[model samples]
Target chain A: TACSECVCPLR
Target chain B: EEYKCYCTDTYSDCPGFCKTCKAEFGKYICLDLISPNDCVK
Candidate 1:
């Protein structure tokens, strides 16, 4: 899976 | 007045950071800072 630990478009 | 916009991720194994700022012409600019090997397992 892709980790988005910090921030993104769909936080 | 202008304003600032930002977004971030929250994970122990992964760390992502992004930020945006208001600019002229009713537009905004943004940037992202993330590790190369932190997103994939």
Candidate 2:
């Protein structure tokens, strides 16, 4: 789904 | 909430980076990058 990546608040 | 202050690099990605900063340094923290010079109490 949308190349599933994870990111938020840097670390 | 009193969190410990930590710095971040200039080549990272994410929204509310400053909000994240404001999160902990509230003080905030982030990923690692030679752990350069940034953020201070």
Candidate 3:
């Protein structure tokens, strides 16, 4: 989970 | 009411924040949709 990648959304 | 930021599907996608925070804080807290950039608990 933590080792995986992540991203955010646009506001 | 609920928030729909991103990566809140039983997981997190708040960018690198979720990645690191998930480790430092764990999915328990970083599970929030609009969780802080720090993603800290």
Candidate 4:
């Protein structure tokens, strides 16, 4: 699952 | 017979190279994660 804070540009 | 590793979905959509061992000899391929300082190593 992706984290809410995760703002990975790759995503 | 198998290798193990860790990855954060938040970062990479796929599991990164966390750990690996030789099929016969037995070894590891420590990557950016899986540090001894962490819960897993």
Scored by lDDT, the top model is: 3
lDDT (10s digit) by residue, model 2, range A1-11: 11112222343
Residue B7, model 1: lDDT of 23
lDDT of 3 by residue, B1-41 (tens): 12344444323333453442343344323453443343222
Interface RMSD of each: 8.8, 13.2, 7.6, 11.3
The top-ranked prediction according to TM-score is 1
Candidate 2, pairs of clashing residues: B24-B27, B24-B28, B25-B28
Worst 10 residues of 3 chain B by lDDT: B1-10
- Give a tens-digit lDDT track for model 1, residues A1-11: 32333333332
Worst 10 contiguous positions by lDDT, candidate 4 chain B: B1-10
TM-score of chain B of each: 0.22, 0.18, 0.16, 0.17
Candidate 1 wrong stretches, greater than 4 Å: A1-11, B1-17, B35-41
Ranked candidates (DockQ, high to low): 1, 3, 4, 2
Q: In model 4, where do residues sit more than 4 Å from their true spots? A: A1-11, B1-25, B34-38
> Which stretches of model 3 miss by more than 4 angstroms?
A1-4, B1-4, B8-32, B38-41
Across A1-11, the per-residue lDDT of candidate 3 in tens digits comes to: 23122234343
Q: Judged by TM-score relative to the true structure, which candidate is superior, 2 or 4?
A: 2
Clashing pairs in 3: A7-B15
Q: In model 2, which runs have C-alpha deviations exceeding 4 angstroms?
A: A1-11, B1-22, B35-41
Per-model TM-score (chain A alone) = 0.18, 0.16, 0.14, 0.29
B1-41 per-residue lDDT for model 4 (tens digits): 01222332232222233222222224222223222222221
Q: DockQ scores for all the models shown?
A: 0.19, 0.03, 0.13, 0.05
Over the stretch B1-41, how does candidate 2's per-residue lDDT look in tens digits? 01322335222333243333223424334442222222231
